[PDB]
Design a protein around this ligand. Sequence first.
Ligand SMILES: [K+]
Ligand SMILES: [K+]
Ligand SMILES: [K+]
Ligand code: NA
Ligand code: NA
Ligand SMILES: [Zn+2]
Ligand SMILES: [Zn+2]
Lengths: 340, 341
Amino acid sequence: MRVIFSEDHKLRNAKTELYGGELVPPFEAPFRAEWILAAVKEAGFDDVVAPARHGLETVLKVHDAGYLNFLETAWDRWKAAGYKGEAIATSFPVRRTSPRIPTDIEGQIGYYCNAAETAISPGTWEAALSSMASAIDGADLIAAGHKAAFSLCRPPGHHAGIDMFGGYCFINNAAVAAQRLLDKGAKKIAILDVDFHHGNGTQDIFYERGDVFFASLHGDPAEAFPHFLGYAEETGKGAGAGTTANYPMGRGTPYSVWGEALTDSLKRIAAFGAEAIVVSLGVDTFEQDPISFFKLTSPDYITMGRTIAASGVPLLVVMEGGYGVPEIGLNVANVLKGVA
Amino acid sequence: MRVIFSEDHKLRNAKTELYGGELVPPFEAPFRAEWILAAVKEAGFDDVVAPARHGLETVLKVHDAGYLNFLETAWDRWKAAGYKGEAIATSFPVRRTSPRIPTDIEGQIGYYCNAAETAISPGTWEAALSSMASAIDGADLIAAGHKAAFSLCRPPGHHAGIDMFGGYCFINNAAVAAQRLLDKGAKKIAILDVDFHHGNGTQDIFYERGDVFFASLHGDPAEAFPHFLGYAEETGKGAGAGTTANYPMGRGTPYSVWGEALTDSLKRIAAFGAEAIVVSLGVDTFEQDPISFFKLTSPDYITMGRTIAASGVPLLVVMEGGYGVPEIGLNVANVLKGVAG
Ligand SMILES: [K+]
Ligand SMILES: [K+]
Ligand SMILES: [K+]
Ligand code: NA
Ligand code: NA
Ligand SMILES: [Zn+2]
Ligand SMILES: [Zn+2]
């Protein structure tokens, strides 16, 4: 399978992340793409191509225009305001608050944010565009007839909701990919999130749409970021009633239980009738991940990939989470091995 | 008027505050109380008494029990979880999110917070309780028959809602004081928030309550913290309809315009029929204060006190915000002179 990768991902190189009450070096650093890229090539996937140029037409069908306009100029405005650090929101539109949109940069960054551990830095916008481009190109390959494809996205995107950034995400790459397949002719597409954290951004985007089925396996929100979405009771709303399936699991969950949730999600995706599956791939489900509590081993990823590929429909794999140890590359490559 | 002040306020001495993308020393520091106290004493108000001991009965009538339980054990759980810094929420229940309450410290701190620039640290719980106590004793003096009283509260409270802390606030002292007056006999009470920022927390607590009228003058939320509340359109909900009046104002607002809003809020308060008025006093409206965009001068705080005191009803002044500028005490003292007459 071809691999879509952009070097502009390095344009996103934030110097701080709010974690544990301190501003430490970002968990989502440029070396993640470097390590993963090296491992896939090592696993035989050496056909890496850069993404072509794309407009905002696709993304404008899954993200709010106000939100996108905000991201494009967020940094400039923050710096213009005289702030010394990176752009970080501290005030949020939570319970029982007005739906009105602030005008100043301080108010808008909070309005458009769901997580304060994510800082907007110089070049974040450009990086997010390149990453989105990689997802769009991967979709085109699938739309062209290829059975599999890997969009090495960075920054990740499953936490980017309709009009909010957070969890290191700015533009929901998988959502853009699924939307791309639809504009290319598909009628039904499914997004499967295997990343450890719930794909709240993705769920929000398609929660009221019946044309995209969203399935996510993840750490119980009761005790895992993003914390405020991902419960099994969330199955869809209105036009999207019934097209959302969350599978929250506790601490220490091994492939034994995980594998079962995967099977079920695939059963519901088939029943949905997906013409293709966009896989939000996160390897932070690894037993050695620094910020997750699942216990999957490197071999499990080969099993995971094979199972998903057995669906019989084309697959577009999109990079999401996975941090710390260098095995993230191994684990990502193992998934592509299974799929191939 | 008598001044209620607790030394335990210093127990609230957070080391960090998220501002402009950095962690810096909190703007709501202990020296604020120190300079305010000294200024009011120099102005004659030197009858300072420490607050008495109080339970949680009053506060439990305005704050969610879960939220209060969270505050009490917040720091211990955060430390136990192994975080090196102070407790600061990073994830928040914003638009289109589940109403379920997380079970771990990481999720709950976010669930109970409305502003990440506030950090919970050793002593916050204790400090917040002593500050609440000062508010309670202040209200008790009013219920006794005193014309006015000053509760030198710290930490402040008007940004703490029913079940959320933020804006340097944990327990809404003004709200507690108002509840206390109702418990001592009053049927109707009003809270007037003159602090530069909107008192989103106080509004939240009494938004569906008809026994307490909430008026507030503040910088337009469209361009000022807390950013998501304080619009003129918010007049109340359900049982609390019509008992909430917001007076947002733009950049460079002179006392000339500010006083007009003060006069209208007092007119609405009088029409409501308040038996007493709790004044959430913030002096960050001062032209020399760095965080605000209003242009009030020191003399205007004397006018402010006079006007509110002219209402004819007893007044409990509760200390809120105000950047730590050298004139912070002078301005608070001027408001008290105005009330004194
Ligand atoms: K997931
Ligand atoms: K105010
Ligand atoms: K000012
Ligand atoms: Na859906
Ligand atoms: Na009210
Ligand atoms: Zn993840
Ligand atoms: Zn203030």
